[PDB]
Amino acid sequence: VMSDLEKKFIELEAKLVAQPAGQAMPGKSNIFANNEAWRQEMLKQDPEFFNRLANGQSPEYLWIGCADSRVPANQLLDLPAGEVFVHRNIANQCIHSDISFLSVLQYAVQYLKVKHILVCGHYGCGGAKAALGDSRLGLIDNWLRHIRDVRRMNAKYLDKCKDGDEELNRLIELNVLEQVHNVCATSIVQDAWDAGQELTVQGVVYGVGDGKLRDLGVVVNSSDDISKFYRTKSDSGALKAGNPNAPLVQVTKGGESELDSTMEKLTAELVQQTPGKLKEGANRVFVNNENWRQKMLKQDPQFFSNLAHTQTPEILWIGCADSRVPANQIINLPAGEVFVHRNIANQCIHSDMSFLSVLQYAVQYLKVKRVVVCGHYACGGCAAALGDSRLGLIDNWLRHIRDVRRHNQAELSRITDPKDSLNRLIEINVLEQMHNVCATSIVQDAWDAGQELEVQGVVYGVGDGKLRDMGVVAKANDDIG
Amino acid sequence: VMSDLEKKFIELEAKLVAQPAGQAMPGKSNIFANNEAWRQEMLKQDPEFFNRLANGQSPEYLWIGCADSRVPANQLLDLPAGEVFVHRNIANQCIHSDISFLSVLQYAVQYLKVKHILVCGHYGCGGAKAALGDSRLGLIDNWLRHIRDVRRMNAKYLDKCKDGDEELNRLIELNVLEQVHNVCATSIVQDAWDAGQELTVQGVVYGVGDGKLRDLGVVVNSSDDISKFYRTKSDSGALKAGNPNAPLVQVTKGGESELDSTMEKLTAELVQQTPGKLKEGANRVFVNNENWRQKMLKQDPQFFSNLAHTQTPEILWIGCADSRVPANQIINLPAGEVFVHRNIANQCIHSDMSFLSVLQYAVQYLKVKRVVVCGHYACGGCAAALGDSRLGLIDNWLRHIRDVRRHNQAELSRITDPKDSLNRLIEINVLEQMHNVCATSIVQDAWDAGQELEVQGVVYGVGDGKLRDMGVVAKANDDIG
Ligand SMILES: [Zn+2]
Ligand SMILES: [Zn+2]
Ligand SMILES: [Zn+2]
Ligand SMILES: [Zn+2]
């Protein structure tokens, strides 16, 4: 008594398992044809294109951006693809308890030893805009309540604004600042800073009309500790030492941590400038961004204005934070014609709000025709899932890939070579994640509402940039009874 | 190449599957002996004890409380067990994007048609206390950052406080008020209110020294809408109608929604009272709580003072929000000797922060010796998981139970009777959830740190209140390579 969705996937798994790990062939969709056209054009311009791509340097930057972004992170930074570790969600949020955010952060900081973290917002952000001008949005409204907290906490700055556009601009800027605060306040960044690890967190925004990054501030190292205001030196370390009953002694009245003060300063510097006309900072991030812009304007004086015209995306791409190729690029589409979600190991966990919010927004509101789950050969997140690391956020998130391994030993057992075996796990993970998006209330509602929505599974190796078909599902009822 | 944990569970599954659905026998632990002693004493006092329990009325209250609570919700409300749908987490949080919270809320509101929602905090809350006086706590500090936002937003009220205790009292009260705000602001409560559904949200606190509920305010129906301040009537409904590009027009400068005003009023009423000495309201909740208290004092004048002395809990109990029996009761222990986490269908999702935060706090900080995952026969959450409902929060959360069904068809296929079939799924769900807690970085660290930690699986039918063994694991390495 399996549902049609269940049957469909058993069929897709057989189709996958009949091809060897890493050798799946491209499929039917025009995305494979477009991906091919791209590969050809790339090889034609530079025959070393993929060799260089497959052999780039580790990323030194973690970039937390928005899903509706018309410019790839590496591009804005004038850096090679893959040199920037990317996380994307609705309105570039850095919610305190969001594990999708926390796991990408911990992976970037502890696994990758990333040196700089950038939170980037963009003017005109559909997420920020929905928070102010739309209601009764369902699931995603719960995600957007965090942006509402930003408007709430900063009413003084917002009410000051002269018009709707100036107010949206300012909310977007304040949103970035608030997320920067959140990144610095995580246990991950606090621990790193306590251990003297070199790690900066900086905010940035830009308008697609010029692609110019404006500065929201950089924090180098600021303790967010306030226990010094409530615990006597003797009672200090109480809870960790098993004593949760040690008294709270008000050492000082209204103490604020170093982080609080740091943010107070950055806020002051943001607010004193005109909304939407912030200055660029002097850090290399801005100078590199500037060289990039000039280079673009050279080859095309309207480059950015066109970028600012691109039509609503018809595809949602869910990929891995490793990202050695921008989604729009791999399928030969203009920057901004694809809505993107990226996390560690391209997971589509059933109950993951970051994933569900992007899905709903794309499927229900933007009405995209396709949802593509894209994995990649040699994925470090997947490789990390098989290791022995005990990191509280990243390693509990990765336990989901372990379930995939465990439930697919029949096929995995046949492969003993480590490389191929990882690559097979990576393929089945894509298949399993596709199943999950197909099973969401979101896709099921769209389907039985008669909405055209294709869920495509894809995988590729950076050495060739060729997309390999993991399966496609046009419609499949998931009802059992 | 399975890990020891994996082998261990294959062994536990065989042991379970050899007993018919609903007939598993009690196990070895003293908890089964204690549960039995309890059943006997109950039957001896009233032979209709379980018959009444098994046939109680559906809950009209949703109660969101804290995991370190020394008093069962139904007790404080002077109501029969099961008459209150309970959710418990660290510091009774109602985080905007917390799916564990959102799925219990939606189930209570849409499935159960609950009429009143109560957010209850308690003085001396270890979660609130840790937020002020302890740092470098790891995973859980990310959960606790939300309480820090409460201190941040309410600095004016807090700095006013004369001492540490008064300041903790006031933070706890403000925390409850902030969570009430969050409950009202959810898409779930906003939708219900828009549909004219009768649904109140009220805040309450109490100190275990008297068990007296104090009022934090009740909100009956307040729109949290602000799109009216930014969207012209024509542009209204833009995003839902597929147009995310409709302009944002600042209709009015600093508009606040009905909810904002409502909360401003409640805050004013809380703040003007002495921290820790709030008044009780006049609603039946308070009058019933009062009758309950007097009844307790009658049979025991020190009832509450003793309650306030109970030692740190030695067990973490993870149960279902249905809860027809308090955890401490079922295993014959004093109110407050068991740390409790409750969600829909007693889920222990790998990446669930609400679950992970309670786990870490109990295992790492309180150092509990046992973690018990308790499921129950005829569980409505599990039954709901097999239905066709498309609710954005509750139904995506339940997809996890669907995975259990799908991966255990070998055993499930043998059963055709709906009742037994559900009951078997419920059993395997407990086993699968135990596996998940065993596989967390938290339990693995404790184990290879040589810390005594037993993970017990248990299930029962309310018709007899007898705990049935689903398995126990004392230690099992989960490393593959
Ligand atoms: Zn955006
Ligand atoms: Zn990857
Ligand atoms: Zn507490
Ligand atoms: Zn239940």
Coordinates of C-alpha atoms in Angstrom, one line a residue, chain A residues 119-391:
Chain A
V119 CA 26.0 39.0 5.3
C120 CA 24.7 40.7 2.1
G121 CA 21.3 42.2 1.6
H122 CA 20.0 43.8 -1.5
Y123 CA 17.7 46.8 -2.2
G124 CA 14.2 45.8 -3.4
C125 CA 14.4 42.4 -1.6
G126 CA 11.1 40.6 -2.1
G127 CA 11.4 39.1 1.3
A128 CA 11.7 42.4 3.1
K129 CA 9.0 43.9 1.0
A130 CA 6.5 41.1 1.7
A131 CA 7.1 41.6 5.4
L132 CA 5.8 45.2 5.1
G133 CA 3.2 45.0 2.4
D134 CA 1.5 41.6 2.4
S135 CA -0.3 39.5 5.0
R136 CA -1.9 36.1 5.4
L137 CA 1.0 34.5 3.6
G138 CA 0.9 31.3 5.6
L139 CA 4.1 29.2 6.4
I140 CA 6.5 31.9 5.2
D141 CA 4.9 34.6 7.4
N142 CA 6.5 32.9 10.4
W143 CA 9.9 33.3 8.8
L144 CA 9.1 36.9 8.0
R145 CA 8.2 37.7 11.6
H146 CA 11.9 38.1 12.2
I147 CA 12.1 41.0 9.7
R148 CA 9.1 42.4 11.6
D149 CA 11.2 42.3 14.8
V150 CA 13.7 44.4 12.9
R151 CA 11.0 47.0 12.1
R152 CA 9.9 46.9 15.7
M153 CA 13.3 47.3 17.2
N154 CA 14.1 50.2 14.8
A155 CA 10.8 52.1 14.7
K156 CA 12.7 55.3 15.5
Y157 CA 14.8 55.0 12.4
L158 CA 12.0 53.9 10.2
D159 CA 9.2 56.4 11.1
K160 CA 11.8 59.0 10.3
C161 CA 11.8 57.9 6.6
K162 CA 10.2 60.1 4.0
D163 CA 8.5 57.5 1.8
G164 CA 7.9 53.8 1.1
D165 CA 11.1 53.3 -0.9
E166 CA 13.3 55.1 1.6
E167 CA 11.6 53.0 4.3
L168 CA 12.2 49.8 2.5
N169 CA 15.8 50.8 1.8
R170 CA 16.4 51.5 5.5
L171 CA 14.7 48.2 6.7
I172 CA 16.9 46.2 4.3
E173 CA 20.0 48.0 5.7
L174 CA 18.9 47.5 9.3
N175 CA 18.0 43.9 8.5
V176 CA 21.6 43.3 7.3
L177 CA 23.0 45.0 10.5
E178 CA 20.7 42.9 12.7
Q179 CA 21.9 39.7 11.0
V180 CA 25.5 40.7 11.4
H181 CA 24.8 41.1 15.1
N182 CA 23.3 37.5 15.1
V183 CA 26.3 36.0 13.3
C184 CA 28.6 37.6 16.0
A185 CA 26.4 36.4 18.8
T186 CA 26.4 32.7 17.7
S187 CA 28.2 30.2 19.9
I188 CA 30.3 29.4 16.9
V189 CA 31.7 33.0 16.4
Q190 CA 31.9 33.5 20.2
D191 CA 33.9 30.4 20.6
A192 CA 36.2 31.1 17.7
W193 CA 36.8 34.6 19.0
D194 CA 37.5 33.3 22.5
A195 CA 40.1 30.9 21.0
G196 CA 41.7 33.9 19.2
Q197 CA 40.7 32.7 15.7
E198 CA 41.0 35.3 13.0
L199 CA 37.4 35.8 11.9
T200 CA 35.6 39.0 10.8
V201 CA 31.9 39.5 10.3
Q202 CA 30.9 42.3 8.0
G203 CA 27.6 43.6 6.6
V204 CA 27.1 44.7 3.0
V205 CA 24.2 45.8 0.7
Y206 CA 23.9 46.7 -2.9
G207 CA 21.4 47.7 -5.5
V208 CA 21.4 45.6 -8.7
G209 CA 21.2 48.8 -10.7
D210 CA 25.0 49.4 -10.0
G211 CA 26.2 46.3 -8.3
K212 CA 28.1 48.4 -5.8
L213 CA 28.6 47.1 -2.3
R214 CA 28.0 49.5 0.5
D215 CA 29.4 49.1 4.0
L216 CA 27.2 48.3 7.0
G217 CA 30.1 47.7 9.3
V218 CA 32.7 45.1 10.2
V219 CA 33.2 43.5 13.6
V220 CA 36.6 41.9 14.3
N221 CA 36.2 40.4 17.7
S222 CA 33.6 41.5 20.4
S223 CA 32.6 39.3 23.3
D224 CA 28.9 39.1 23.7
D225 CA 29.3 38.0 27.3
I226 CA 27.1 39.4 30.0
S227 CA 27.6 36.8 32.7
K228 CA 30.3 39.0 34.2
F229 CA 27.5 41.4 35.3
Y230 CA 25.6 38.6 37.0
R231 CA 28.0 36.1 38.3
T232 CA 30.6 36.6 41.0
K233 CA 34.0 35.2 40.0
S234 CA 33.5 32.2 42.4
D235 CA 30.0 31.4 41.0
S236 CA 31.3 31.8 37.5
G237 CA 31.2 28.6 35.4
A238 CA 28.4 27.3 37.6
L239 CA 26.1 25.5 35.1
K240 CA 29.0 24.0 33.1
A241 CA 30.3 22.6 36.4
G242 CA 27.0 20.9 37.1
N243 CA 25.6 23.6 39.4
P244 CA 22.6 25.3 37.8
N245 CA 21.5 26.6 41.2
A246 CA 24.4 29.1 41.8
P247 CA 22.9 32.6 42.6
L248 CA 22.5 35.5 40.2
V249 CA 24.2 38.5 41.7
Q250 CA 23.5 41.9 40.0
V251 CA 27.2 43.0 39.9
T252 CA 26.2 46.1 37.9
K253 CA 22.8 47.5 36.8
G254 CA 22.5 47.9 33.1
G255 CA 25.6 46.2 31.7
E256 CA 25.9 45.7 27.9
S257 CA 28.4 43.4 26.4
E258 CA 31.3 44.4 24.0
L259 CA 29.1 43.2 21.1
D260 CA 26.2 45.4 22.2
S261 CA 28.4 48.5 22.2
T262 CA 30.0 47.6 18.8
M263 CA 26.6 47.2 17.2
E264 CA 25.4 50.5 18.8
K265 CA 28.3 52.2 17.0
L266 CA 27.6 50.5 13.6
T267 CA 23.9 51.4 13.9
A268 CA 24.9 55.0 14.5
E269 CA 27.0 55.0 11.5
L270 CA 24.4 53.4 9.3
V271 CA 21.5 55.6 10.4
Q272 CA 23.3 58.9 9.9
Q273 CA 23.5 58.2 6.1
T274 CA 20.8 58.5 3.5
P275 CA 18.8 55.3 3.0
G276 CA 19.9 53.6 -0.3
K277 CA 23.0 55.8 -0.6
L278 CA 25.4 54.3 1.8
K279 CA 29.1 54.7 1.3
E280 CA 31.4 51.8 0.3
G281 CA 34.0 51.0 2.9
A282 CA 37.8 50.9 2.3
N283 CA 38.3 47.1 2.8
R284 CA 39.5 45.0 -0.2
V285 CA 35.9 43.7 -0.6
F286 CA 34.8 47.1 -1.9
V287 CA 37.9 47.8 -4.0
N288 CA 37.6 44.3 -5.6
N289 CA 33.9 44.8 -6.1
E290 CA 34.7 48.2 -7.8
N291 CA 37.3 46.7 -10.2
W292 CA 34.6 44.0 -11.1
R293 CA 32.0 46.7 -11.8
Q294 CA 34.3 48.7 -14.0
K295 CA 35.2 45.6 -16.0
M296 CA 31.5 44.9 -16.4
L297 CA 30.7 48.4 -17.5
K298 CA 33.6 48.2 -20.0
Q299 CA 32.2 45.2 -21.8
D300 CA 28.7 46.5 -21.4
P301 CA 27.6 50.1 -20.3
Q302 CA 24.1 48.8 -19.6
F303 CA 25.3 45.6 -17.9
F304 CA 23.7 46.5 -14.6
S305 CA 20.5 48.2 -15.9
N306 CA 19.7 45.0 -17.9
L307 CA 20.5 43.0 -14.8
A308 CA 17.9 45.1 -13.1
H309 CA 15.2 44.2 -15.7
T310 CA 15.5 40.4 -15.7
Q311 CA 12.1 38.7 -15.4
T312 CA 10.8 36.8 -12.3
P313 CA 12.6 33.5 -12.0
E314 CA 10.9 30.4 -13.4
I315 CA 13.1 28.0 -11.4
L316 CA 14.0 27.3 -7.8
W317 CA 17.5 25.8 -7.5
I318 CA 18.4 24.1 -4.2
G319 CA 22.1 23.5 -4.1
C320 CA 25.1 22.9 -1.8
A321 CA 26.9 25.7 0.0
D322 CA 30.1 24.5 -1.6
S323 CA 28.9 25.9 -4.9
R324 CA 31.7 25.8 -7.4
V325 CA 29.4 27.1 -10.2
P326 CA 26.5 29.6 -10.0
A327 CA 23.1 28.0 -10.7
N328 CA 22.3 30.4 -13.5
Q329 CA 25.6 29.8 -15.1
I330 CA 25.5 26.0 -15.1
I331 CA 22.2 26.0 -16.9
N332 CA 23.1 28.9 -19.2
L333 CA 20.7 31.6 -17.8
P334 CA 21.1 35.3 -17.0
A335 CA 22.0 36.2 -13.4
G336 CA 18.7 36.4 -11.6
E337 CA 16.5 34.1 -13.6
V338 CA 16.9 31.4 -11.0
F339 CA 15.8 31.6 -7.3
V340 CA 18.4 29.9 -5.2
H341 CA 18.6 28.1 -1.9
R342 CA 22.0 26.8 -0.6
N343 CA 22.8 24.8 2.5
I344 CA 25.3 22.1 3.5
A345 CA 24.9 19.0 1.3
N346 CA 21.8 20.4 -0.5
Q347 CA 19.4 19.1 2.1
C348 CA 15.6 19.3 1.9
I349 CA 14.7 18.2 5.4
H350 CA 10.9 17.6 5.8
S351 CA 10.6 20.1 8.7
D352 CA 13.3 22.6 7.8
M353 CA 11.8 26.1 7.8
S354 CA 14.6 27.7 5.8
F355 CA 14.0 25.2 3.1
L356 CA 10.1 25.3 3.4
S357 CA 10.0 29.1 3.3
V358 CA 12.1 29.4 0.1
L359 CA 10.0 26.5 -1.4
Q360 CA 6.6 28.1 -0.6
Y361 CA 7.7 31.5 -1.8
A362 CA 8.9 30.1 -5.1
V363 CA 6.1 27.6 -5.8
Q364 CA 3.2 29.3 -4.3
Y365 CA 4.0 33.0 -4.8
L366 CA 6.5 33.3 -7.7
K367 CA 4.8 30.2 -9.3
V368 CA 8.1 28.7 -10.6
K369 CA 7.6 25.8 -13.2
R370 CA 10.6 23.7 -12.0
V371 CA 12.4 22.9 -8.7
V372 CA 15.9 21.6 -9.2
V373 CA 17.7 19.8 -6.4
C374 CA 21.4 19.8 -7.3
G375 CA 24.2 17.9 -5.7
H376 CA 27.8 17.7 -6.7
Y377 CA 30.5 15.0 -6.9
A378 CA 33.0 14.9 -4.1
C379 CA 30.7 17.1 -1.9
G380 CA 32.5 18.0 1.3
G381 CA 29.4 18.2 3.3
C382 CA 28.5 14.6 2.3
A383 CA 32.1 13.5 2.9
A384 CA 31.9 15.2 6.3
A385 CA 28.8 13.2 7.1
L386 CA 30.8 10.0 7.2
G387 CA 33.4 11.3 9.6
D388 CA 33.7 11.3 13.4
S389 CA 33.4 15.0 14.1
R390 CA 31.2 16.0 17.1
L391 CA 30.3 19.6 16.3

